[PDB]
Coordinates of C-alpha atoms (C1' of nucleotides) in Angstrom, one line a residue:
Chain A
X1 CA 1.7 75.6 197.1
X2 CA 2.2 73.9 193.6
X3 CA -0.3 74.1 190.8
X4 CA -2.4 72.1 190.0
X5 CA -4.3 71.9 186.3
X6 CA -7.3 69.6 186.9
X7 CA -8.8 68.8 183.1
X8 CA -12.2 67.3 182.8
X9 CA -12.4 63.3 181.7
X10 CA -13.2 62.2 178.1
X11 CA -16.7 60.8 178.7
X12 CA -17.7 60.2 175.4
X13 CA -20.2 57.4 175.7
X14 CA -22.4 58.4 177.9
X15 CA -25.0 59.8 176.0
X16 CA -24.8 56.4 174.0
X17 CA -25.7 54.7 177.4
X18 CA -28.7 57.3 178.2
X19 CA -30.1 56.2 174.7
X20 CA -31.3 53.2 175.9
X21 CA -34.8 53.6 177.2
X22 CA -37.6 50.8 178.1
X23 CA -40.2 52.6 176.0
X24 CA -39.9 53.4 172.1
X25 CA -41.7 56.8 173.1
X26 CA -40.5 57.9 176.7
X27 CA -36.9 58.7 176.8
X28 CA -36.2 58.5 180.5
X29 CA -33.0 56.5 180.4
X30 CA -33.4 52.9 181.8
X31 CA -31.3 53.2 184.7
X32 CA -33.8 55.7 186.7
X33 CA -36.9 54.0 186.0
X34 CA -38.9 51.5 188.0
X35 CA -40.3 49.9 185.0
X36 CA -44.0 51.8 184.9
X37 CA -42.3 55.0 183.4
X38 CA -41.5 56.8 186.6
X39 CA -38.5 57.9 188.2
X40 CA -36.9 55.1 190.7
X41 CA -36.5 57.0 194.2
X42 CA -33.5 56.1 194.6
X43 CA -32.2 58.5 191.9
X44 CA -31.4 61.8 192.7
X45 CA -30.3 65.0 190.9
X46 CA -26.5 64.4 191.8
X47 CA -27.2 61.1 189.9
X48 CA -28.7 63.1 187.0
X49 CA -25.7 65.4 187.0
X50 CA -23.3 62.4 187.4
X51 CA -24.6 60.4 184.1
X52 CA -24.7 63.6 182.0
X53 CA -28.5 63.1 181.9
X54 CA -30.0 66.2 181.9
X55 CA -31.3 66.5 178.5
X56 CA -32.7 63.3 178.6
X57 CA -34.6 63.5 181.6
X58 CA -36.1 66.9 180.0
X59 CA -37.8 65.5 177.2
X60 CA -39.4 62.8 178.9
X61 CA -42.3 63.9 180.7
X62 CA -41.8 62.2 184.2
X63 CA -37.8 63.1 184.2
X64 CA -39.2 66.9 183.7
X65 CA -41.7 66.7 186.9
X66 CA -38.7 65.5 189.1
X67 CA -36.4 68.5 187.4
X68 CA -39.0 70.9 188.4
X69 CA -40.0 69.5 191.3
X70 CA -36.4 69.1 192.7
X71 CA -35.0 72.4 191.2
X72 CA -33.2 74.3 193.9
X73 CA -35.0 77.8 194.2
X74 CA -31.6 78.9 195.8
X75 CA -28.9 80.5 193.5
X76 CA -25.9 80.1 195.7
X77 CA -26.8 76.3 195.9
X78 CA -24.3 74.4 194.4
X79 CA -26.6 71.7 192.4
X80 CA -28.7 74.6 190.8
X81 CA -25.7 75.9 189.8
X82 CA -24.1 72.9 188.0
X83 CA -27.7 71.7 186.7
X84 CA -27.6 75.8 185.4
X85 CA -24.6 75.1 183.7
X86 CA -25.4 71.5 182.0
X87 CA -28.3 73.7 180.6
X88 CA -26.4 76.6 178.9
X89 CA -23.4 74.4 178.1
X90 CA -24.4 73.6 174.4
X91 CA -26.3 76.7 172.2
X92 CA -27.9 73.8 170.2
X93 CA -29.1 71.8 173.0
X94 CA -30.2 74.5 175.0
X95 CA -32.4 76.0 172.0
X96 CA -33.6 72.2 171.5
X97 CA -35.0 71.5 175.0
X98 CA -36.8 74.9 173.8
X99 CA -38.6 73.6 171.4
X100 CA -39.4 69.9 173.1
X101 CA -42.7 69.7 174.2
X102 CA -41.8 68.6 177.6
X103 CA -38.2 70.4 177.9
X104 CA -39.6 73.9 177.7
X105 CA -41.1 73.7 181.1
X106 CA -37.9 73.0 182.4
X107 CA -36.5 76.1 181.2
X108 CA -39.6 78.4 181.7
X109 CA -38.5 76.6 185.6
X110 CA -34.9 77.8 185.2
X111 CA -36.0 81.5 184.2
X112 CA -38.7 81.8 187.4
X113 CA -35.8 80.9 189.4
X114 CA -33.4 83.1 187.7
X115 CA -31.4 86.3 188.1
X116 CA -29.8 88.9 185.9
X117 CA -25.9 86.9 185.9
X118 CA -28.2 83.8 184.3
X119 CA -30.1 86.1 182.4
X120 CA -27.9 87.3 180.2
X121 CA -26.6 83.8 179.0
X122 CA -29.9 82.9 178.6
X123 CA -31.2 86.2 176.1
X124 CA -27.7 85.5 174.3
X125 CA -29.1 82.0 173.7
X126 CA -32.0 82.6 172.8
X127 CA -31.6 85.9 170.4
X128 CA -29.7 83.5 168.1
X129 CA -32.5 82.1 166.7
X130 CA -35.6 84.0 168.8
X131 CA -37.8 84.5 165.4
X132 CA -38.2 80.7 164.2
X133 CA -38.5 79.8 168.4
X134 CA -41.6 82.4 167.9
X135 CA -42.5 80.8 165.6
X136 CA -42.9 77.4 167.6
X137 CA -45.1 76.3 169.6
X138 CA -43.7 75.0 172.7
X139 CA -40.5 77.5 172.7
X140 CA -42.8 80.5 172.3
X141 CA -43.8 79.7 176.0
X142 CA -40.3 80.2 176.9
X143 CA -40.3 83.5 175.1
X144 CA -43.3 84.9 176.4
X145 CA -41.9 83.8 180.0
X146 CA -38.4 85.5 179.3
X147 CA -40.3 89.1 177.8
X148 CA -42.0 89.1 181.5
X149 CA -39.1 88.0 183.9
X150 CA -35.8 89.4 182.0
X151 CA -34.7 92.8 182.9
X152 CA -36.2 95.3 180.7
X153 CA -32.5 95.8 179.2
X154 CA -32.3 92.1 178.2
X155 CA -36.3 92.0 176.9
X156 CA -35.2 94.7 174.7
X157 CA -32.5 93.0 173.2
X158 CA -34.9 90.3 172.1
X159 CA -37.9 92.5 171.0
X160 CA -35.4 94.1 168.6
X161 CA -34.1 91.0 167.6
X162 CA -37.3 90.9 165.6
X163 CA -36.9 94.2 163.8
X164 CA -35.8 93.1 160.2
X165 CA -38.3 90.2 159.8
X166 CA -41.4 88.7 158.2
X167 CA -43.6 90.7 160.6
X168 CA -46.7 89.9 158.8
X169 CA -46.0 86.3 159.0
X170 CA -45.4 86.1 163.2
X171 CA -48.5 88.3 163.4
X172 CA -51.1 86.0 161.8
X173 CA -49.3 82.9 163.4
X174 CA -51.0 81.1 165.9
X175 CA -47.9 81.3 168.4
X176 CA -45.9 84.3 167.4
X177 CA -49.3 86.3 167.9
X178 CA -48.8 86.2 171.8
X179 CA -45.3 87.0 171.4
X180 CA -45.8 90.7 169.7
X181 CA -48.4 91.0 172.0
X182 CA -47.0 90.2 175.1
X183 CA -43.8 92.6 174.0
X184 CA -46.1 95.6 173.2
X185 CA -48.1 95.0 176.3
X186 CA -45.6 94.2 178.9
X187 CA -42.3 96.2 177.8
X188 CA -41.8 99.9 177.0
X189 CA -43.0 101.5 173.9
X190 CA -39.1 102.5 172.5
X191 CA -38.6 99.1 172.7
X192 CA -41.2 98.3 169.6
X193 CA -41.0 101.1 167.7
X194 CA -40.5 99.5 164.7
X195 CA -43.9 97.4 164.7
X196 CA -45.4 100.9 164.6
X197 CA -42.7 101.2 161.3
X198 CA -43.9 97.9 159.8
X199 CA -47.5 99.1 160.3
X200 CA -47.2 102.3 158.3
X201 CA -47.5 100.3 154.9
X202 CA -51.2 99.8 154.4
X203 CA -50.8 96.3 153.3
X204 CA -49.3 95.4 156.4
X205 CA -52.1 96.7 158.0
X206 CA -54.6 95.0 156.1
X207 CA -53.5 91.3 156.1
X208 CA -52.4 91.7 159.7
X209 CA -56.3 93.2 160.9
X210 CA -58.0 90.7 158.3
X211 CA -56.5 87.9 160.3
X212 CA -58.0 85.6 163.1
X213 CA -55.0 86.5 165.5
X214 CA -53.4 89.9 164.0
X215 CA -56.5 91.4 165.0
X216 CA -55.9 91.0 168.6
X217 CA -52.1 92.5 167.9
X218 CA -53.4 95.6 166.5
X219 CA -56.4 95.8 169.0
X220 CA -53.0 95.4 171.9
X221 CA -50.7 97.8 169.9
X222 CA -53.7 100.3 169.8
X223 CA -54.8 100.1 173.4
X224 CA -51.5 100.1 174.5
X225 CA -50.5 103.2 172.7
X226 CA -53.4 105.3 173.6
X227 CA -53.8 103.8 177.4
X228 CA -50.6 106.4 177.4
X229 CA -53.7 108.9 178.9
X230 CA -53.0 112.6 179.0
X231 CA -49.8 112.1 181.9
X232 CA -47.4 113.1 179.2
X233 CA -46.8 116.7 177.7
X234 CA -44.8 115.9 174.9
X235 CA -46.0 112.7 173.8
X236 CA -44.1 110.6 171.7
X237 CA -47.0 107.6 171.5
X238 CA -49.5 110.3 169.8
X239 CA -47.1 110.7 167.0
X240 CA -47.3 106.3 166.5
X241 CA -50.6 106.5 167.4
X242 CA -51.2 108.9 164.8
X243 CA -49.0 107.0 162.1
X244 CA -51.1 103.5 163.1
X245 CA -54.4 105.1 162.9
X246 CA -53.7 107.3 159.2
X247 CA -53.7 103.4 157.6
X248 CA -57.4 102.3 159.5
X249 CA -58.6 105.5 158.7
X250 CA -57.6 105.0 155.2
X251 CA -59.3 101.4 154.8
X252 CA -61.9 102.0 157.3
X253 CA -64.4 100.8 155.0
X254 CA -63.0 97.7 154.1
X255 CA -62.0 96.8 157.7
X256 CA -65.4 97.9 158.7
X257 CA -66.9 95.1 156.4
X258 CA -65.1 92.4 157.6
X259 CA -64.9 89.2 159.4
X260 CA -62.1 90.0 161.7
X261 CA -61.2 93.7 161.5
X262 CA -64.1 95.4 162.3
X263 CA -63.9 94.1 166.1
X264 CA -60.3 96.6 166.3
X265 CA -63.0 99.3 164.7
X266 CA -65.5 99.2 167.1
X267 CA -62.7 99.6 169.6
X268 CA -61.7 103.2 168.6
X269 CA -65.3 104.2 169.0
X270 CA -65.8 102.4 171.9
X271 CA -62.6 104.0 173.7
X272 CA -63.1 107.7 173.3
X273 CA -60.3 109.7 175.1
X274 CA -57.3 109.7 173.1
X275 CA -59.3 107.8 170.4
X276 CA -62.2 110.1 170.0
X277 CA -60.6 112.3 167.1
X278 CA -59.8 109.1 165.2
X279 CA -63.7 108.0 166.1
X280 CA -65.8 110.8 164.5
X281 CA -62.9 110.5 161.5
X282 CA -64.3 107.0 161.1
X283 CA -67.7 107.8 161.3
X284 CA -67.5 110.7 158.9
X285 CA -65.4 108.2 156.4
X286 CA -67.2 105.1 155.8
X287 CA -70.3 105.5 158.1
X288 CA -71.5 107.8 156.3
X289 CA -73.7 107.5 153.5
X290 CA -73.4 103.7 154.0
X291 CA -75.4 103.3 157.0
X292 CA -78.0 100.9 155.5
X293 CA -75.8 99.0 153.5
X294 CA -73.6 97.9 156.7
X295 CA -76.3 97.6 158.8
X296 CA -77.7 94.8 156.5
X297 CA -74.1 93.0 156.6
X298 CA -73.3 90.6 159.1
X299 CA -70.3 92.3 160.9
X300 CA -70.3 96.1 160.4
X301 CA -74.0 96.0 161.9
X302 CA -72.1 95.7 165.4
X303 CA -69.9 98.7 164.2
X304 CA -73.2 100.8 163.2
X305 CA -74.4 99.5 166.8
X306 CA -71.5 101.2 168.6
X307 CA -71.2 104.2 166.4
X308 CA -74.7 104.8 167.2
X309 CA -73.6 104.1 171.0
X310 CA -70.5 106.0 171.3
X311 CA -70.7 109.2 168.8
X312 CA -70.8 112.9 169.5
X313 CA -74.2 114.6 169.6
X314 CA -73.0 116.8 166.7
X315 CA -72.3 113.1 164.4
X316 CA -75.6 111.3 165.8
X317 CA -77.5 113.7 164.4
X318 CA -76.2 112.8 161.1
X319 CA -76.8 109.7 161.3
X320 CA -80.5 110.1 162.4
X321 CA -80.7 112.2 159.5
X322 CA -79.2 110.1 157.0
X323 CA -81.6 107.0 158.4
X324 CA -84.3 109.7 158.5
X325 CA -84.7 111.3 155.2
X326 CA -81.1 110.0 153.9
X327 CA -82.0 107.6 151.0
X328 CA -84.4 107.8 148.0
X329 CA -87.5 104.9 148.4
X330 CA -87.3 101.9 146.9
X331 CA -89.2 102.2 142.8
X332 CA -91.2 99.1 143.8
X333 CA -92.1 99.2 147.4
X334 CA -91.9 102.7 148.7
X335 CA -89.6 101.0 151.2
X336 CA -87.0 103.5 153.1
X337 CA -83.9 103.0 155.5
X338 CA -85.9 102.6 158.6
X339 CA -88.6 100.2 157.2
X340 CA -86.2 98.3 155.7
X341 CA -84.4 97.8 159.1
X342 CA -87.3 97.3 160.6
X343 CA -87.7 93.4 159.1
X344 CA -83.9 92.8 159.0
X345 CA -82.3 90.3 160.3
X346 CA -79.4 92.4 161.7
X347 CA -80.5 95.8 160.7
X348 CA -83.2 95.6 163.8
X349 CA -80.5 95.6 166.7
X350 CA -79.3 99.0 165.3
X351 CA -82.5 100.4 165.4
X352 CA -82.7 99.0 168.6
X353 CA -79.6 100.6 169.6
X354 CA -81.1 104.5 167.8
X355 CA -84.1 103.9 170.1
X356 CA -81.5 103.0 173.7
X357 CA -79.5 106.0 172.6
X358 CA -82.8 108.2 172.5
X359 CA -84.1 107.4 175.7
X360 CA -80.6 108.1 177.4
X361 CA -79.9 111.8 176.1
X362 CA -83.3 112.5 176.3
X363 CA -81.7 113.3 179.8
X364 CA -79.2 115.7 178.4
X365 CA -78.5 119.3 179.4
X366 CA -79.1 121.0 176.5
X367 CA -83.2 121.1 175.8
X368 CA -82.4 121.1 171.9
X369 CA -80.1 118.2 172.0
X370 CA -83.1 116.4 174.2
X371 CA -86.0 117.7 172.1
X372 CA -84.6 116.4 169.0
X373 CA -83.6 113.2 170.5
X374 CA -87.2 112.7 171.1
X375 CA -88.5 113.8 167.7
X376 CA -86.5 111.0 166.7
X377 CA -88.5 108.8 169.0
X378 CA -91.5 110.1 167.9
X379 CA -90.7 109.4 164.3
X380 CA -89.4 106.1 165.1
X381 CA -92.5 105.2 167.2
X382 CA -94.7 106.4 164.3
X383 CA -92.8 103.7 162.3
X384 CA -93.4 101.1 164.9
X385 CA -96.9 101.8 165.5
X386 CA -97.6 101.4 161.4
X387 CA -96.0 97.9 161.0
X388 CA -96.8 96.6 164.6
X389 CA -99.1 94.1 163.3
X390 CA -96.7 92.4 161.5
X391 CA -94.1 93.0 163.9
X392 CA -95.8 91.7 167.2
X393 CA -95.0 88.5 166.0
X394 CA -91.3 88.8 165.8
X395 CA -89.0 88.2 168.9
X396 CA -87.2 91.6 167.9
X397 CA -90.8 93.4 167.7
X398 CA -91.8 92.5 171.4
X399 CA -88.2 93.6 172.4
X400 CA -88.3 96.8 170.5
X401 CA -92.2 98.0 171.3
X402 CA -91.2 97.0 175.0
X403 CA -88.1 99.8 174.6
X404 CA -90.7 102.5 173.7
X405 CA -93.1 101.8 176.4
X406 CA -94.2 105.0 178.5
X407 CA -92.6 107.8 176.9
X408 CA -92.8 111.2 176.8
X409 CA -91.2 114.0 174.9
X410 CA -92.7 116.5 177.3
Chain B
rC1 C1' -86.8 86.0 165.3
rU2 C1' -83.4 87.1 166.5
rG3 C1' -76.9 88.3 164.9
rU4 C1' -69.5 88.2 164.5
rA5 C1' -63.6 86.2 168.3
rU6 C1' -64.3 81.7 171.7
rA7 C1' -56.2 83.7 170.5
rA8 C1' -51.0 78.8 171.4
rU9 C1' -48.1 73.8 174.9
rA10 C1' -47.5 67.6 179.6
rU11 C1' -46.2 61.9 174.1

RNA sequence: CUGUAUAAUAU
């Protein structure tokens, strides 16, 4: 039995000849069309793996449709394998089909139909250059695809790929948004760590929250961390948890009065549980002795709305206090808190909110709690019945004289 | 006279 050394053959020009396309914008190579832009049916994937025409067929949008049609689901199947291998051949063409529009639903193919020997060439290709491929956003697909399907091992690998980067940047993108937040929500908490680390700096924090997109990251990082529940006796989350929530605690005012942040700050009142702590911190830090002025602003009225909603007896009653008796009348109109919130714009679905969360602990267990929950509707209704002349006429009068029909503080 | 998100792919 003699040896035999079989080396491959020089084909050089061949992707020359695959450059040559009917159409200046499809760039399906002109031997496996019919003319209309389609794929002839006489050509086959034996014929795409014969011409070297892989790449070509995957960033034209018809030659992608037969590739994923045609793709054999089967990993000891011979043409999967050698279509596999075209793929991974090249670093820079692999990364490339990545980032082409039509390509990167070829490869998102390639990693549904993948296992763990395919997987590791594929995370070795892509942690090369995994930030800027974030950062795109076709290839982002691909990476949100690959945290989901790749072995926890391999996802790891790429999460921490990111650890030493412009952090601040991938959260406010557009793309790279979906990518943090598909690692923190789908992979295990060691293996993002360090976003909790880059979110100890305040400014982080800030410029992340204050953004159309980051906003949804932290609201994910935070839901994530405390949907941890109380399964754990040592709990390392509480300790990130903890480090995450120090920095909102510590602009909670400014996050409060905001466009985009305050949605992530009604969501730590609105959870309770592991959040509660960090809830009545947030009430006693900016709610406090501010509860006019934000519920006369545009977006911390919603966060006034769900304090009211969500708080602790002990903090509620602070709050009807401070809306109560709270604030010194105005010098020229003998106008307090509640009057003025009366004729606001905004300020009238809190008070609609103090009157729903009233009527629903006046069914309490204590009989203090539920007497002084209707005191306050008494006081409220005292209000009411003084300016419901000019108040009937408003759409917000009718709803809130309809809330205090028939009740009794008995 | 009612009030804030509408989170990124097939030329």
């Amino acid at each position: 039995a003699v040896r035999l050394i079989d080396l491959e053959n020089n084909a050089s020009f061949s992707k020359s000849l695959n450059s040559t396309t009917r159409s200046h914008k499809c760039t399906l190579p002109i031997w496996a069309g019919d003319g209309e832009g389609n794929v002839s049916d006489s050509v086959t994937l034996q014929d795409v793996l014969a011409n070297d025409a892989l790449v070509e067929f995957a960033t034209d949008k018809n030659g992608c449709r037969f590739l994923q049609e045609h793709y054999p689901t089967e990993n000891d199947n011979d043409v999967h394998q050698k279509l596999f291998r075209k793929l991974v051949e090249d670093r820079a063409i692999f990364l490339s089909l990545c980032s082409n529009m039509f390509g990167n639903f070829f490869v998102q193919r390639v990693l549904e139909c993948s296992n763990t020997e395919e997987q590791e060439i594929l995370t070795e290709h892509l942690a090369t250059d995994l930030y800027n491929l974030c950062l795109d956003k076709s290839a982002c697909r691909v990476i949100q695809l690959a945290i989901q399907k790749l072995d926890v091992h391999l996802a790891t690998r790429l999460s921490l790929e990111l650890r030493d980067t412009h952090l601040v940047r991938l959260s406010i993108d557009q793309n790279g948004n979906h990518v943090i937040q598909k690692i923190v929500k789908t992979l295990p908490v060691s293996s993002w760590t360090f976003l909790v680390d880059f979110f100890a700096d305040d400014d982080n924090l800030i410029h992340v929250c204050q953004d159309k997109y980051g906003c949804r990251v932290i609201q994910s990082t935070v839901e994530t961390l405390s949907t941890d529940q109380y399964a754990q006796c040592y709990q390392h989350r509480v300790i990130l948890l903890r480090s995450l929530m120090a920095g909102v605690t510590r602009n909670c005012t400014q996050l409060a009065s905001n466009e985009f942040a305050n949605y992530v700050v009604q969501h730590v009142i609105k959870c309770g549980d592991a959040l509660a702590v960090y809830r009545d911190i947030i009430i006693e830090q900016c709610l406090l002795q501010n509860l006019l002025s934000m519920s006369q602003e545009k977006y911390a009225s919603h966060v006034v709305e769900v304090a009211f909603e969500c708080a602790p007896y002990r903090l509620v009653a602070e709050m009807m206090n401070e809306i109560f008796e709270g604030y010194i009348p105005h010098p020229d109109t003998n106008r307090d808190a509640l009057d003025i919130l009366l004729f606001h714009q905004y300020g009238n679905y809190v008070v609609q909110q103090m009157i729903q969360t009233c009527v629903l602990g006046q069914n309490a267990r204590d009989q203090k709690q539920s007497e002084m929950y209707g005191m306050w509707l008494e006081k409220i209704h005292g209000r009411v019945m003084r300016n419901a002349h000019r108040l009937e006429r408003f759409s917000s009068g009718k709803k809130i004289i309809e809330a205090l029909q028939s009740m009794s503080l008995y």
